[PDB]
Design a protein around this nucleic acid. Structure first.
Lengths: 247, 60, 228, 63, 143
RNA sequence: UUGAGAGAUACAAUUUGGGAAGAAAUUCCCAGAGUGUGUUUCUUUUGCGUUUAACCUGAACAGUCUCAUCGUGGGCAUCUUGCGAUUC
């Protein structure tokens, strides 16, 4: 009962307070009994939802960053009529560094809502994009496989692209949500939008997320919490902590 | 029907059953063994007679 | 530290120590005839290598009526290089006797040395198929083993068993399918040789495929009744 | 009679313990046979976390 | 030439030390066992338990089959966890012998191919269909 | 998508026996076996169209001189990052 009661309270406080109206996302912060031994990189680690979808590519604009050549990538993606309406913009890293700096960079930051790049370029990405993107997890660059094909030692790779696979990645991503490991007990994840869905959906999402995080299976991805979990607080971008599952 | 009757006929004729890792089979009858040289080899008879019934000679 | 344990047949022992192994009790101790290892516990012992002695593979393969006994007289066709015949001498012990036969030479001299070390051995250095040159020296074997690649296994057994194997005697033969046929399946060859012996007055009691140790061999064991 | 059966059971348990194994059985089977005879890149470990959950309905639907 | 000598000496080491390890190690017999019966009724009524005068697991286990009358391990130190693991340990240990052995065999073979490449003659380099190099010498009797 | 065979199974039900518990009814343990269904293995057959087919070789890599092997210098980390191997 505490959960949805606090949810109603935080909602009404949002619609009353000016700025609390202006910030628009629900965030939940889990404090764990033990710290995490996983040092913070910026690899966007995502968590699955079993019940309810959240965002749709049809609803969101999107940016893709390729490898350097990008000719066949872009033309194929724009041609195969499964992504031509889907990816708002496509750019190579070198062209990006040639085109945007400073002011225009933060202009991008304001414009786009979700970006992704090839997993062979993600680690290079930060310096061309900027600490300005690299805050929080709202416009944290994602990482999608692009070929559905692998590399072997001493074997040249061959590069391809398939809209079915890539569109599957995007739809999966916007269906579910993500997180980033830390080295202390405090980890934060955005959970749901303030009007796209309802309190029962919120609670279902929360329960599925906590079950995934506590699940013994999928240790490389889901079994990451160490020790008995302490509690879960809820907030928006500027609100105060609200307690759930105190013990 | 007639099929299963034929099957159980073959069962009541077979002299070899499997008992786990062990395998069981008879010792044949001395009377037959003396009065009859063993039967022939279907593989080899089919070989040679098919060879005479080769399709290069227009045996048809 | 090392544990000894007896087998279904007399004289065969398994050592459970850091390892588990097949072993016999040396009358002549501390003299490893072909570089085989050994163990003591006190008393002495001597190991078998199944990969080198066909009969050993049979022992591990499991055989009920393997008629070779301690207090027994056993004939040994195909005794070459002295290894397995030394082992059977050691398992029959002082009261048992092993009538070994060879017809090559070099293993003959090796067997000569082996006899020079053991009394239960008695070597015969003669034709496999001409059993007279030893009829006049061999008498009333009770159990016969043969590992020979002369495809007249059935003959040689029939002859020397009529001349030597006392009634209701025990007979055991090793068969190399790749030696006798090498074209038709070893199962077929085994069965065929079975009715061969069947006609040749062996009651065939059992056979072991020597599968995980040697390629394409069968050990056949039978008895010998109302025969001669 | 029954005492003899009980002694049989006890010594049988002894021998079984001497020769016992449960799954080391199959393990040593594979090893003895050998003796007698997903995605991962090598250069970016960050990929195993980075990947997404391929989902059959998520490809199939034309939403 | 000296590299070849070194490698081949190591290969001989591993090879025969393997053969020793095996000769002290033991395998399990998996061979077929077909029993002879002189009557179909005895066939049907057959039971290995009664034919052996033993028990269930005694029948199923192969290399040691002791009868009930023949019957008529805490001294083993924690056998449920210890001796089994050491047996698997020995089996493994043999395994890496043999695999290291084959690896060194390959190394020595390729390196002697290189030596031959060096020695003398009228060589020819062909790229065989799967994409693998090889060398063929013109028909020529070296004097 | 001719028959037939052999075999592997998997599933389901059916039962063979030894031990134990049980007054017994029953239960347990253990090795089983067959039936059917699903799966696949493999063989031969049956009929059909069809005379070649693969490998080897003889004076057969080398004027845009090929090939080998030590060394030097540079490219590809947005990765063929290079094994007593042959990255270019």
């Amino acid at each position: 009962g505490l959960a949805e009661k606090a949810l109603k309270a935080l909602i009404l406080q949002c619609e009353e307070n000016p700025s609390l109206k202006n910030d628009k996302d629900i965030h939940i912060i889990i404090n764990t009994g033990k710290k995490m031994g996983i040092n913070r990189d910026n690899i966007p680690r995502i968590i699955p939802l079993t019940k309810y979808k959240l965002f749709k590519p049809r609803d969101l604009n999107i940016l893709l960053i390729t490898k350097d050549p990008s000719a066949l990538y872009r033309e194929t993606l724009t041609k195969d009529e499964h992504t031509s309406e889907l990816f708002k913009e496509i750019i190579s890293v070198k062209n990006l560094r040639r085109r945007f700096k400073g002011s225009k960079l933060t202009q991008l930051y304001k414009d786009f809502d979700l970006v992704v790049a090839d997993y062979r370029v993600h680690h290079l990405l930060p310096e061309v994009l900027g600490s300005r993107f690299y805050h929080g997890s709202k416009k944290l660059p994602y990482m999608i496989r692009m070929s559905k094909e692998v590399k072997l030692k001493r074997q040249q790779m061959v590069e391809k692209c398939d809209p079915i696979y890539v569109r599957a990645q995007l739809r999966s991503i916007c269906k579910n949500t993500s997180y980033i490991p830390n080295n202390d007990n405090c980890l934060s994840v955005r959970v749901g939008y303030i009007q796209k869905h309802s309190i029962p959906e919120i609670l279902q999402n929360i329960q599925d997320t906590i079950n995934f995080l506590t699940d013994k299976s999928k240790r490389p991805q889901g079994g990451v919490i160490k020790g008995g979990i302490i509690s879960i607080f809820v907030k928006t971008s500027n609100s105060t902590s609200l307690p759930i599952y105190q013990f | 029907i007639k099929t299963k009757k034929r099957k159980t006929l073959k069962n009541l004729r077979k002299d070899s059953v499997k008992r786990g890792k062990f395998r069981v089979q008879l010792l044949s009858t001395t009377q037959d063994s003396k009065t009859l040289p063993p039967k022939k080899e279907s593989s080899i008879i089919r070989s040679k007679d098919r060879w005479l019934n080769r399709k290069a000679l227009n045996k048809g | 530290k090392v544990v000894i344990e007896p087998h279904r047949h007399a004289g065969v022992y398994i050592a459970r120590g850091k390892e588990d192994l097949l072993v016999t009790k040396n009358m002549a101790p501390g003299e490893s005839v072909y570089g085989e290892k050994r163990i003591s516990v006190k008393v002495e012992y001597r190991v078998w290598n199944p990969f080198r002695s066909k009969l050993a593979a049979g022992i591990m393969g499991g055989l009920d009526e393997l008629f070779i006994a301690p207090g027994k007289k056993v004939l040994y066709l195909g005794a070459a290089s002295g290894t397995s015949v030394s082992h059977v001498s050691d398992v029959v012990g002082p009261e048992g006797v092993v009538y070994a036969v060879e017809f090559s030479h070099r293993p003959g001299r090796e067997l000569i040395s082996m006899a020079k070390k053991r009394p239960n051995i008695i070597p015969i250095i003669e034709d496999a198929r001409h059993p007279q040159k030893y009829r006049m020296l061999i008498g009333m074997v009770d159990c016969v083993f043969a590992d020979v690649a002369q495809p007249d296994q059935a003959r040689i057994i029939a002859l020397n068993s009529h001349m030597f194997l006392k009634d209701q005697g025990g007979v055991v033969i090793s068969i190399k399918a790749n030696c006798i046929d090498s074209t038709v399946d070893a199962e077929t060859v085994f069965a065929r040789e079975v009715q061969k012996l069947r006609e040749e007055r062996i009651k065939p009691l059992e056979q072991l495929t020597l599968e995980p140790y040697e390629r394409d061999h069968c050990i056949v064991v039978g008895r010998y009744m109302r025969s001669g | 009679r029954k005492y003899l059966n009980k002694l049989i059971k006890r010594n049988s348990q002894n021998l079984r313990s001497w020769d016992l194994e449960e799954e080391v059985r199959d393990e040593l089977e594979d090893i003895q046979q050998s003796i007698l005879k997903f995605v991962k890149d090598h250069r970016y470990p960050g990929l195993t976390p980075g990947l997404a959950p391929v989902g059959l309905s998520d490809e199939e639907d034309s939403s | 030439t000296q590299d070849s000598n070194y490698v081949r000496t190591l290969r001989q080491i591993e090879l025969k030390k393997l053969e020793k390890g095996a000769k002290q190690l033991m395998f399990k017999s998996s061979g077929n066992h077909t029993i002879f019966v002189d009557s179909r009724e005895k066939m049907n009524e057959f039971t290995p338990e009664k034919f052996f005068n033993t028990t269930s697991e005694m029948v199923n286990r192969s290399e040691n089959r002791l009868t009930k009358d023949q019957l008529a391990n805490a001294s083993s130190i924690m056998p449920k966890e210890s001796l089994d693991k050491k047996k698997l340990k020995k089996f493994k240990q043999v395994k890496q012998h043999l695999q290291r052995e084959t690896q060194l065999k390959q190394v020595q073979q390729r390196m002697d191919a290189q030596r031959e490449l060096l020695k003398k003659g009228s060589k020819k380099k062909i790229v065989d269909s799967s994409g693998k190099i090889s060398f063929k010498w013109k028909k020529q009797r070296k004097r």
